[PDB]
Paper text:
Aspartate transcarbamoylase ([name]) catalyzes the second step of de novo pyrimidine synthesis, combining l-aspartate (l-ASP) and carbamoyl phosphate (CP) to form carbamoyl-aspartate (CP-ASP) and phosphate. Aspartate transcarbamoylase ([name]) has been suggested to be a promising target for antimalarial drug development. In depth structural analysis of the [name] catalytic cycle has been performed previously, which indicated that [name] exists in a low substrate affinity “T” state and a high substrate affinity “R” state. Here, we describe a series of small-molecule inhibitors of [name] [name] with low nanomolar binding affinities that selectively bind to a previously unreported allosteric pocket, thereby inhibiting [name] activation.
Initially, we performed a 140-fragment structure-based screening experiment using a subset of an in-house multicomponent reaction (MCR)-compatible library and the availability of high-resolution crystals. As the smaller fragments used in our search will typically bind with lower affinities, resulting in weak electron density, pan dataset density analysis (PanDDa)15,16 was used to analyze the results of this fragment screening experiment. Fragments A, B, C, and D bind in a buried hydrophobic cavity formed by the α3 helix, α4 helix, and β1–3 sheets of the adjacent subunit. Enzymatic assays indicated an IC50 for these compounds of 10, 125, 150, and 145 μM, respectively.
Residue numbers in the entry:
A (entry chain B): 38 to 383
B (entry chain C): 38 to 297, 312 to 383
C (entry chain A): 39 to 294, 312 to 374, 379 to 383
């Protein structure tokens, strides 16, 4: 097994280590696990795009527990399970209060855990996902909590970037990736998580925002510590801009965030913020020719429909890639055992 | 090697044309396709009634999107998918506003379309289903919208009628089917759709209604155009009545509707009908049909609802099958 | 096919259980209870050894839950899916909004044409019986407001039989002593289990604050059933208002404030005592007990998987049996 046809992947060895691992945080994924996820993820991409058998995990039964509406993420996990050939029982359209009708998180996960092979859990509370992990006799995949932990979003963001700039794996001092994060860097937690993971590689960061909504010093410290550990830190590593014109020069990746209306003092600030950072074909004319545009979605006005037609636009391929990356993670974690002949290979 | 009464079906040829067809409107189904749906539909009826292997479409993953409560139709589509051996992901008990959460229908179907092989979509908005079809990289089956497009209801209504009156396929000047539509002909959109399909054959129509609630001239014109194309139109093709005793004489089919005291079906009302008369109702009923009639052999509305399973299985098989061989098709 | 001592004709018992509807624990006779316990154990051992569990593929069920009972719903879904079958779900609706002015008769006459069987939970007693008379397919009652909950009763019994297998023997010399603690008036899981336990050689301690004691209705049924098997005595049914007396010489404690279970309260019970609770608990059992080896309430919940798989297998199969 090979990735970038350069890095050799012992999926037997890496699956033995990943067996029944719970994935709460992007920090629960090390270098060799990230390689295994990217290789396996690509095999699912190529098998599904060629209309081939995808049933690499058949005999499993999951429970999906979504205690807030996040239909896109929920359907993405259901599709991955179902396309792998396994089965799922769904708990949706409930919250914390209505689902845990008094009963403790501990008791609830101790019970449900005896019914199934694993649990997909989305809950705005960060408390609950950690209680779930300590009470469950089965692996949990965090599909998102209010600490901004969303490992599969982070994983799928990375897979998308690696697809166009495979050198980001190399940790080569001469092959640096430059990325701009645009919009609400304070509340865009998908930025926080992806930044942390990108930070493990040779990466420079443009943080494009309007003071009130800047990246937290929290995440800048983590980025800095991680670049220093790999001797990729310089005074050029992290740059700050309040405008696209400067923000978007010499970056391989533009990652747009949600600018939600509920986040300003009024609709005054909002429309003066939205339309400031709105992405046009005009805004993109002075970017690199190889620039790729990511957005975790849903996009509202952040990106005008005209950009969907620009070849540098890949946000929908990004969403699509979530299927392959969730299939890969499930296969690696829940596969009963490993022989080499069993593994997805196109 | 595939026949419906006496007409030979090239199911291979018809499936090549139907592959990844989106079915929004009854008019998306032509003669050859309607025959394929009726043959396939009958095969599933006979396979399920004899407790036989049903799994003619495994390996497929669907999304069902119901943005209004339509539990019976939803369960019917889920049962068809599951009994064919495929799998489905459900989005229900949400509305337009609460599901799209401000995001565009275009974006939503462009994404969901990448997760699955096909989408079942029910939405009161007619706008949304057509946007979904233009934005989706996969086939859509309309499970109902507020334009009164409901192709599988129309298809299942037709399968039920053909089951008792197979001559409706013959387009024989001497073998005419007479049907009475009773109740709210203005708002009963299942009448509108079925009329349009029946209209392609040798059929006479009794439209039995209130005053405020008669069939719209829109539908009468479509019936007339379609009868004229096959030279089955006469001044006796379309008749109007305000009462059952006249409404229900010499009609092979009675099709009752949701009439939200004068258009109530009794055993008494049915004494003046033909012996071979069959009674349809898309359901749910309230008082339009008295529980008495559920015991009358002419009553087939529950077999009709049952037939929804076989017809939705047939349509999913014909659209989503990833096949090459005649031998692989249901042939029990 | 044996339970060590009793030989089971699973072929013969499945022929009689085929397409049986299960509403009430009284719909299950001796032979059927044996088949459910044998089959239940086979699925326990197959799942604990990570073996193929797909003994009922090719079926499609509908699950209709018209009140929140998420644990019970998920338990049934897991059983169906682990058997290899499929299910279509109707949940997070109630009676009013589900039967949108349409009759239960029409609803079940239609839905029953779409699927091989129906799991139905509804607080109304009326509705489950209408559903059974109007359905062309078998119904499993997952709970109604008459306190009929056969699979809870079945799973309670399997749990007890697991530690005290002699409860099957109807041996005058091998008696099981059980204490039911808490709200015996409203705890309908007590009523149903009492009725089933009553068919065997069992003595009952009813521990409550009087206002909430077991209804005379249930005591009469316990007495009729003990008399039919000549296990009734003046010691068959005792009443207490306190644990220290309540919990002496009882093989089973079944929990449903002086009725709160501590490690302290458990010190003067038998060494073989096992603690059941249908769950969810609040304070009736302190988290400290969850660490006591007598504590088996979570194994009990777990056993609901094996027992619902067994019941679905026995009713909907068309037959090679689960073994080993
Ligand atoms: N909150 C928006 C949900 C719409 C959607 C569902 C599944 C996939 C893509 C979009
Ligand atoms: N709100 C009406 C639901 C009744 C019904 C459910 C499923 C199938 C047939 C009828
Ligand atoms: N009383 C809250 C229900 C929580 C639960 C869900 C599924 C399985 C077990 C418990
Ligand atoms: Na499902």
């Amino acid at each position: 097994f090979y990735i970038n046809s350069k890095y050799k992947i012992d999926l037997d060895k890496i699956m033995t280590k990943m067996k029944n691992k719970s994935v709460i945080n992007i920090d629960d994924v090390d270098d060799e696990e990230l390689l295994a996820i990217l290789y396996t993820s690509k095999q699912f991409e190529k098998i599904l795009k060629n209309n081939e058998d995808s049933k690499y995990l058949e005999n499993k039964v999951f429970c999906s527990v979504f205690l807030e509406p996040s239909t896109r993420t929920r359907c993405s996990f259901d599709a991955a399970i179902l396309k792998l050939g396994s089965k799922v029982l769904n708990i949706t359209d409930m919250n914390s209060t209505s689902f845990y009708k008094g009963e403790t998180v501990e008791d609830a996960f101790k019970i449900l855990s005896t019914y199934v092979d694993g649990i997909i859990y989305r809950d705005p509370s960060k408390k609950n996902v950690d209680i779930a992990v300590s009470s469950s006799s089965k692996p949990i995949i965090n599909a998102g909590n209010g600490t901004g932990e969303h490992p599969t979003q982070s994983l799928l963001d990375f897979y998308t970037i690696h697809n166009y700039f495979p050198f980001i794996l190399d940790r080569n001092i001469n092959k640096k990736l430059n990325i701009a994060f645009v919009g609400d860097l304070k509340n865009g937690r998908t930025v926080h998580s992806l930044s942390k993971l990108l930070s493990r590689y040779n990466v420079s960061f443009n943080f494009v925002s309007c003071k009130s909504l800047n990246i937290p010093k929290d995440i800048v410290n983590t980025i800095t510590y991680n670049l220093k550990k790999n001797n990729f830190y310089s005074d050029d590593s992290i740059k700050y801009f309040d405008n696209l014109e400067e923000g978007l020069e010499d970056v391989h990746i533009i990652y747009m965030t949600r600018i939600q209306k509920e986040r300003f003092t009024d609709v005054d600030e909002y429309n003066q913020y939205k339309n400031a950072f709105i992405l046009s074909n005009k805004t993109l004319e002075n970017t690199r020719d190889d620039t790729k545009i990511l957005h975790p979605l849903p996009r509202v006005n952040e990106i005008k429909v005209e950009v969907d037609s620009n070849p540098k636009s890949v946000y929908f391929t990004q969403a699509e890639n979530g299927l392959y990356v969730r299939m890969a993670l499930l296969y690696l974690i829940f596969s009963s055992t490993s022989s080499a002949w069993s593994h997805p290979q196109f």
